């Protein structure tokens, strides 16, 4: 059933993804279809993620530790839109890996790093949520640490992403020109088999479990129920506000799992039964999921807008060059003081709370 590519070479038709078009694998139009999907994605992913990164940096008020983690996520998405999607697009219209083996490596490595980093960052977010809920004590926490933490996630991400570059597994996806870890063969010199189990479980699965677990602990504490006003089942507006953040974080995770999980499952199943067909082992299946994972890059900016008024209002401030932020503003801390932005609403040295300075702000 299999050749180096997913299709059988009953005919001599099969040709290397590096050398020629893969038109035999799927209809040519399907190639343009995937190319089309990528092109549109590039626009959305770039604009949305840039907006997120831009807005939080631009608006002084949105400086939360969580915001730091989100920039990290946004950054990971940006790399996808700039780095990975572009190559994936070129290939698609070419119908194969014009770039050749070196590039397959470059292209797989960066995209792999992006996926690993995302799930790992989501875990940090989960843990931080747990910490915020149980121990509101603000001082046990530092912005500086967050940067350190973010860097750490990247380091671990490299731990999986980089070793394939080290003599380890390698390869292109079903129709593909997307490159990923070598699930198909057990290229012995390469020691593929070991790498495969290790990577999925350690990088994707374990972090998924932790996020799930941390999620459960949060269940006892702040839950979905949150009354819009501070009053009612909320003990302080800040407490009531936080519940909003947690819910978005939950949705962010959910969307993440839905997008990626199918790929990871297919990752493993072919590992167990390579050279065979799953329900059907084909170009189409592997392809659909990996490209689907790419869509994730776009979803987070949408969730933010829908999910939180603060970003929504603050973003709008950014969109219209001037303030022009009608629509009711944040009606809370657009900024703590009032409106928030680089300028405009976010007044220098935003106000402080408590005789002492409760939040590390107004420093």
């Amino acid at each position: 059933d299999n050749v180096l590519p997913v299709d059988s070479d009953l005919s001599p038709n099969i040709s290397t993804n590096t050398s020629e078009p893969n038109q035999f694998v799927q209809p040519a139009w399907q190639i343009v279809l995937w190319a089309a999907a990528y092109t549109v994605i590039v626009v959305t992913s770039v604009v949305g993620n840039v907006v997120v990164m831009w807005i939080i940096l631009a608006h002084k008020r949105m400086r939360t530790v969580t915001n730091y983690f989100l920039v990290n996520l946004a950054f990971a998405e940006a790399s996808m839109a700039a780095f990975n999607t572009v190559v994936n697009f070129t290939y698609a219209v070419h119908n194969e890996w014009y770039y050749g083996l070196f590039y397959c490596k470059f292209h797989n490595f960066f995209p792999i790093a992006a996926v690993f980093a995302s799930i790992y960052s989501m875990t940090a977010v989960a843990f931080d949520r747990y910490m915020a809920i149980i121990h509101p004590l603000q001082p046990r926490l530092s912005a500086t640490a967050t940067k350190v933490v973010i860097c750490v996630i990247w380091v671990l991400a490299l731990l999986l992403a980089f070793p394939q570059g080290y003599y380890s597994t390698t390869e292109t996806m079903p129709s593909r020109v997307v490159c990923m870890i070598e699930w198909p063969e057990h290229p012995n010199k390469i020691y593929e088999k070991v790498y495969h189990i290790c990577v999925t479980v350690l990088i994707y699965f374990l972090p998924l479990l932790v996020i799930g677990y941390a999620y459960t602990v949060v269940g006892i504490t702040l839950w979905a129920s949150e009354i819009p006003g501070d009053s009612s089942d909320r003990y302080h507006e800040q407490v009531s506000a936080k519940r909003k953040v947690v819910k978005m974080m939950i949705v962010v995770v959910c969307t993440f799992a839905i997008c990626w999980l199918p790929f990871h499952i297919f990752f493993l199943l072919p590992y167990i039964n390579p050279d065979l067909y799953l329900k059907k082992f084909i170009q189409q299946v592997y392809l659909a999921i990996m490209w689907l994972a790419m869509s994730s890059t776009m979803y987070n900016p949408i969730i933010y807008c829908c999910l939180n008024d603060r970003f929504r209002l603050g973003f709008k401030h950014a969109f219209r060059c001037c303030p022009f932020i009608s629509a009711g503003d944040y009606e809370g801390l657009e900024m703590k003081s009032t409106r928030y932005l680089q300028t405009q609403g976010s007044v220098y040295k935003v106000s402080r709370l408590e005789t002492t300075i409760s939040t590390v702000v107004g420093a």
Binding site: D9, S15, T16, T18, S19, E20, P184, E185, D275
Partner: peptide, 11 residues
């Protein structure tokens, strides 16, 4: 029993 990758086969 997938066929082995051929270096020469690659163009």
């Amino acid at each position: 029993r997938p066929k082995p990758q051929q270096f020469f086969g690659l163009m």
